[PDB]
Symmetry: D2
Subunit: 472 residues, 4 copies
Amino acid sequence: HMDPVSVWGNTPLATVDPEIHDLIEKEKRRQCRGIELIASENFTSFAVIEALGSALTNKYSEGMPGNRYYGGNEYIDQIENLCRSRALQAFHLDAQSWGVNVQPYSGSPANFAAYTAVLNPHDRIMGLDLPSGGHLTHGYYTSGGKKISATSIYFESLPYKVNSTTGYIDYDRLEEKALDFRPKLIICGGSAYPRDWDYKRFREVADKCGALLLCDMAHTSGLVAAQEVNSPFEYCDIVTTTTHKSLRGPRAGMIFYRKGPKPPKKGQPENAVYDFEDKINFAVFPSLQGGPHNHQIGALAVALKQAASPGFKAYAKQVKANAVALGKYLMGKGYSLVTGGTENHLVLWDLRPLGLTGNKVEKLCDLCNITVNKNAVFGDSSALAPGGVRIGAPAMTSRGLVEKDFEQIGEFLHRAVTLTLEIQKEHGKLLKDFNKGLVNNKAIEDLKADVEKFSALFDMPGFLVSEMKYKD
Amino acid sequence: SHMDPVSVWGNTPLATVDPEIHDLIEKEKRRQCRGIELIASENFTSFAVIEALGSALTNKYSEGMPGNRYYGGNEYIDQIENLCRSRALQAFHLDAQSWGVNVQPYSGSPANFAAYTAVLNPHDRIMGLDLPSGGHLTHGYYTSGGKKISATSIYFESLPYKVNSTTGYIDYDRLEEKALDFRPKLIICGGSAYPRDWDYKRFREVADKCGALLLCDMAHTSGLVAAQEVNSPFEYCDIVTTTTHKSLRGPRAGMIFYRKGPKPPKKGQPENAVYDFEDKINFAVFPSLQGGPHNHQIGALAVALKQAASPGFKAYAKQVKANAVALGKYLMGKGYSLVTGGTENHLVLWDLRPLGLTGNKVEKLCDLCNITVNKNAVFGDSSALAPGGVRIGAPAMTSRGLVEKDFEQIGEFLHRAVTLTLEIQKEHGKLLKDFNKGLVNNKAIEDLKADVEKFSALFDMPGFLVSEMKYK
Amino acid sequence: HMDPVSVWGNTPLATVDPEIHDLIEKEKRRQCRGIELIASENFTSFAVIEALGSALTNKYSEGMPGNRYYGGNEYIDQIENLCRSRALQAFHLDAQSWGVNVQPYSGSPANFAAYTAVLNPHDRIMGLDLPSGGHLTHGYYTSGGKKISATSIYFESLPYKVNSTTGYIDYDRLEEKALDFRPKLIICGGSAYPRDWDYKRFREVADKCGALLLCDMAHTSGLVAAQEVNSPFEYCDIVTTTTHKSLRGPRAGMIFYRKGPKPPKKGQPENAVYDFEDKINFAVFPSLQGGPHNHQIGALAVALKQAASPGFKAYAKQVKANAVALGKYLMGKGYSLVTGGTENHLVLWDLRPLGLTGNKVEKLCDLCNITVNKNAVFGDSSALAPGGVRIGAPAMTSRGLVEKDFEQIGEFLHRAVTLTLEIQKEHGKLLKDFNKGLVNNKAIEDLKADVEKFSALFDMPGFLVSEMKYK
Amino acid sequence: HMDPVSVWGNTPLATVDPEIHDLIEKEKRRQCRGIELIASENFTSFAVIEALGSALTNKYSEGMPGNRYYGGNEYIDQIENLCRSRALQAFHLDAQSWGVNVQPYSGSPANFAAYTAVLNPHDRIMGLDLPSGGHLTHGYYTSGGKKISATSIYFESLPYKVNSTTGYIDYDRLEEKALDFRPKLIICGGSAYPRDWDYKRFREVADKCGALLLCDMAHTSGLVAAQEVNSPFEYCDIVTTTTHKSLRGPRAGMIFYRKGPKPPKKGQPENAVYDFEDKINFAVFPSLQGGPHNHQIGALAVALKQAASPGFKAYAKQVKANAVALGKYLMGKGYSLVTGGTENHLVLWDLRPLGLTGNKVEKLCDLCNITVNKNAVFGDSSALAPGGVRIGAPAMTSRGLVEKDFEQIGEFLHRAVTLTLEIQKEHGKLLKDFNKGLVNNKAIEDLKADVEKFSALFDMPGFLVSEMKYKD
Ligand SMILES: Nc1nc2c(c(=O)[nH]1)N(C=O)[C@@H](CNc1ccc(C(=O)N[C@@H](CCC(=O)O)C(=O)O)cc1)CN2
Ligand SMILES: Nc1nc2c(c(=O)[nH]1)N(C=O)[C@@H](CNc1ccc(C(=O)N[C@@H](CCC(=O)O)C(=O)O)cc1)CN2
Ligand SMILES: Cc1ncc(COP(=O)(O)O)c(CNCC(=O)O)c1O
Ligand SMILES: Cc1ncc(COP(=O)(O)O)c(CNCC(=O)O)c1O
Ligand SMILES: Cc1ncc(COP(=O)(O)O)c(CNCC(=O)O)c1O
Ligand SMILES: Cc1ncc(COP(=O)(O)O)c(CNCC(=O)O)c1O
């Protein structure tokens, strides 16, 4: 016999799947009881989460609002239309000059669709090299010639790099490379670059070589919405983004593109108009994706409303201030930060002067409930044991931490790195030897206890701590 | 210019933070439980799945594999993903020594593109079921006019195989002849609108004769496969891809299953040869194509896979098939043309061309009656806007507890709707603008809508509590 | 010290390089003392040869006449212009409707340039499958999936086949495949197809799937010039060819292409014109080739004047009549010819009913001074030991042989295949065992002697038999 | 009736085709009555020409000696074997360490086959940029991004350039580009580079990036054979060449490749052997070409015997001395030569400091029977009106000219450029205006007459002037 609808279909998770329920409750506790510093993470709102976990998941809605491949989309269409209009509003865009596709499943799908829209297979792209701070999907292949991202397989990549001494983008080498390589598309924006971008110069280079210019603002999108960093929309043809990083929304992607009359250009006819909209929509669907994830789109619409608020503007300001305060504390202890500071939400910490690799710092921190990620820095070839760790402010800022709290985070990090060195000095640099120091280390247990005491006190968005299964 | 307290932006319910989106979700909830939802790729998932989907799991970056991540903090995410993978193998009755599974694909189209990228180089040759014959977009779809539609016909070289134009069954002889001439690297089986089971044994014989890999995309029928109610592709295929939101009744996600261990003996193949899909498939998903896994989808999928392994789910799958057959017999008794003259799965494909109708007209009129279908290509179609068919599926309404007699009532509603569509076309014209005039103040549409809603209200509804919904 | 110009630069080959001179003299004797049946071979004229071996070899002339990348082309331009105009005249083409590029180094370069002009990498082509009679450059990959020609690597090939029982092109399967595969270019013409081509049906198929239509007439180009087979120009967008086969010229290629207004077609705009010329020229140079080989172009101009003569039409008629007479004799002995005859210059002889492969027949024939080539027939997978031999009439017809002489050739071939069977019957099918039967074989010696006696009855173009070193 | 064999087949060209015969005789006179300075031209020997115009043209001989697809090759095989063996001898190569394919129809076919042998479509190559002196087939696309050579279409090119101060290859910039772009193949050798090549440094760069190293020695092959320039064979994996430039043979190409045991390398198994031979042969045939041109192969065998002689070594020395003397004379008049001199057979003359383009100098020289070619120099973007002219010594040296005669050539060139300036000064820089000065110009007539008077006296290889139709 079939189970009654109520039994399988309405019973709460806690009863249907106690194993998964318990693991989610353990993860909720973990998010509360640690210092969460992954620069691409955030804590999104309960309101976003209620839309994300909703009956919107049940609907097939391929196509565009008002031109679907399925019936039943009267309300899904209104949700998607509201999501798109709120996206334009959040970034201060005129709807006659910009459009947006909100269907990409995540950031990497958004980028691959934007590229597919404007490029044929094997067309040439240039993005920021991964060890210089660019993303996998900006054309990443290794210095050993190994193609990693599919954006280096289906397209031809030549990454541009930062200056090897200052850590800032080398705009002169960018121009020289672009004039030699003749890319169809230049990508700006990054995953681990701690400075703002001269989009005007990128536009000058793109015009000189006849390339399209795309900005991937995934990491700093929340700061862009708050008008706290340079706006890529002033100079770029296409702007892609994720929505779950500094924008504090669900996991999703968006592709913004110019519409309407083109600016004057010698060699271009008069009354010319942009022609990105149809190509970008087609690339997302039917070229690459299938059904939109409407629960993500609904959740994203919520997040875009929240991003347009004065409270969100203050949040973005505080993110930047917290990142600067943390960077200043770390440099005050003698640590090496790439570019010697930050203009955004992250710092990239070069551990090579200490004789450490980022995997060791990440692992020790993780045992202490300090959540970071090892990260490539300039010149790295090892993804297993890169030379850096990357620290971001969005998630802890969302819990209400201010500059003095981020100075405490700096001291926790300083204690963690000091302990990592002590373990390496005692047990060795080989990872199998280093790991011996991670067992029954009283200093690790004591640092973990201190971190938990610090972390547990702060508020947590997304659920009620008073209702959670694990309060200790 | 202060930040909002965490409680205000971060803990307040959706109903207060975003009344507009809340109201639209409430309207969509009513729409889902007050009409007859017949899109064959839709289902109504459980509340337990939805609670995992809307959870703190959305906040985590966890690129890599369990135990080998690019970020710290994955102690519990790793346990959730491991449980998802093990439950996936268990749901399909697979030995872990012989099969593995990647549960990170964001959806079905991402799963297929990653599976192809794993085993194919750009421009390698594929053969899948042609879209008008019932195959999916991602099976290499380009049109009979030569227009490349799916990226699977751009980045790879496609030659679709077709059904027999008179019987509607796959033409296995032309499949073999085509494969021996075209020499594909990969043959794809499984479909989106094919109403019969698949001779996987014959597909394996063809693949062996031409040296191809064999992949089954069981997206639509995966729930039936898990319940052992249709042929298992795992007996004969190298790789099996699927979505999880169709007959499997889970969240929107994809999975890629692949063989592991020793290869079966083959002449010319060396002794002790082993499969080598695992590393390539994992690498294709990440870092080649995707970024961070969507852990809330993975957790929700783990729940759905536990639910799929139950005796109640097997009974559900049996009932889905029985309902589809009863609907088909009812429609054929009236004279309606079903491809292959019936069904062996969860759907029927209905050719409207003998009536002089296109599927967009039927879909539009049905929608006004709260009967949710999709227009669908049938053999020989070239129009996606106005195809010659409509596709009807049993999973969603079967999940509301409907049995055969209820599906006969659905058949009568569809007969009434198609009759009304034909009557409107006879009175108002075949041109869409003229036809549309017949949809205003149509008393028979209103009567049918009222009858549909009264019938729909007789049944329970999974995923949310009807007693608590805003629009009662 | 440098050698004086007269020593290194003006002294004849016979003194500068006796080894190469002696080998050329032996090759000259071989060509006029055997029976030369390779269907793609001919004996070109002394006049063609004099232009081929000339100071034209010294010139760099990249570009087009009147638009060169080098100085000094006052006369090279006149030679190339005359070659092009004579090419159009030889094929009865109006210069308003057809142009031609005469720079391709050979046939395979001509085809690759024609494809490059109209296709992007990986665009789809369909040509006649090699075992069905098509050329390597028509998209050849094997039934085992191994890409052989670069035309299956840089482009995406789906070959069409002959009917497995009749040997004629299966036009219904061609159309069905083209509608499914949607090629950008369909190629017709072949290397071992013994029948004429329904270019009209090819045009109907090409129009149904929106493809360009190209004919590679390399083998039969001489017959086309003589209006002795169907003209591909009536229906094809592009016609490629070699010049050294039935056309009886130097080794070179040409690409003909339509110019001017396009014929009426639904959907295409009014006043639309062909746009092949610039693309085809650019593909030849600077895309693929470097300097034209002006000695080949000059020699080609000579051959094209000779091909337009009344004597050449008579030659082309005789080539066809000789091929038919040869095929009739062979079938009268019970041999299996693909399609049961011929409409062109060649026959394709299926040896499989005899239990032989073409490599054995080719090898025994070679020992008798009967020059053939083993050849794929339908279903073959082995290039080493294919199931057929291909026999052509152009070369021996150029020595003046007529039907009764080709009947004697048929008898020599019958003797050779009989001896091949006798050796296999005694020594077996394994090649190493078969080869043992070729040592001190008195019947081989007798057949060779009869072949040389017969071959010496006829004149020889291209050089004077009376002046050759080895008489 | 057919024409008798003697009539069509044995009658001399002078009777069969008086039009073509007369044009060849006019061309023979032109070659005698001018100063022929195209650096890629030569005057080959009568002995070469007799093999080139021979019955060898009649033979189909696809395959390799002893492994043909046609009967009848008993003597063609001996000719090809002798050509190959003499090719190895002429370049002082051990047959156990090097092989050679002598079937390429010309230089561009040789290069495309060599690339096809070792590369897949879209693999990466780096060659000398055309304006820096590289050949079309070294990956030429323009600074405007226009793909010109098929070697920039079927493969992915990134050219390396000369240093703008010195005019020599900038080896550090080559290394930097190679490490960023990661080519599969690096090409050295050139068409208009007036200096020798540091093959040792090319090998160091290739090893640092894991690339194959190919030298295209087409222009200087005669100097290489005479051991008068650096040997590429010491360091390159593959060496391609034409045979009609300084080698003084027929128009043809050759591909040399390493064979036998590989040199010691960490990260490579012991007893490793080279594996180029079969791939190179396959690329030439059956991949790209059809029947070999046996008359070219026979003529090439003759030329290779002649190239191995002591007289040819003296010729190669004289070519270099003549180019130096010419360059010294031009620089003494104040002209600008790229790199300030030459180490090979050519000089590249930058006309830009004069306010001239190379098309004007070429046209005026051509009217005076001075045969040159306009040529790109560093920074050029115009193929129509490039900034230089290229001048070579091989052809006139083959007529017996020595250093003092090349000083006279320098004065004729000086008069030509002086006249070009005077015409431009009077009539203007616009080509239509400049062309007005080329009509009824007494100074052009006097220069032409002086050139003819000078040129007519010298000997001419390849035919007997005493027998030519036009002696005035
Ligand atoms: N500048 C930057 N930092 C970043 C990212 C990025 O895209 N750009 N990431 C964006 O997510 C994460 C790192 N993601 C990476 C994924 C794969 C490889 C990589 O090279 N993998 C090789 C080597 C593996 C190994 O040695 O163990 C491979 O997978 O084979 C590197 C980084 C986090 N930090
Ligand atoms: N350094 C160098 N010099 C050389 C050659 C070479 O390959 N490299 N050549 C080797 O043979 C000749 C020049 N060949 C060339 C062929 C085409 C174009 C080119 O860019 N053509 C464009 C633009 C034509 C136009 O503006 O009129 C085109 O064809 O569209 C340039 C040079 C002679 N000198
Ligand atoms: C600049 C940038 N763009 C796109 C993405 C991709 O988003 P998805 O992971 O949702 O595909 C990232 C992810 N970067 C993750 C990190 O820096 O840790 C990114 O940093
Ligand atoms: C066989 C098959 N495979 C893959 C997919 C793709 O799943 P996503 O939409 O999640 O990308 C579908 C979707 N088919 C939807 C339908 O038939 O209506 C499908 O039918
Ligand atoms: C270095 C080089 N390589 C190959 C070639 C091609 O040879 P073919 O033209 O036979 O294809 C050339 C021609 N260079 C001619 C010139 O410099 O004027 C060349 O200079
Ligand atoms: C139809 C056809 N096309 C092109 C070619 C190529 O010509 P080249 O060999 O010059 O590249 C051939 C050669 N066919 C040779 C044979 O059938 O024996 C051919 O048969």
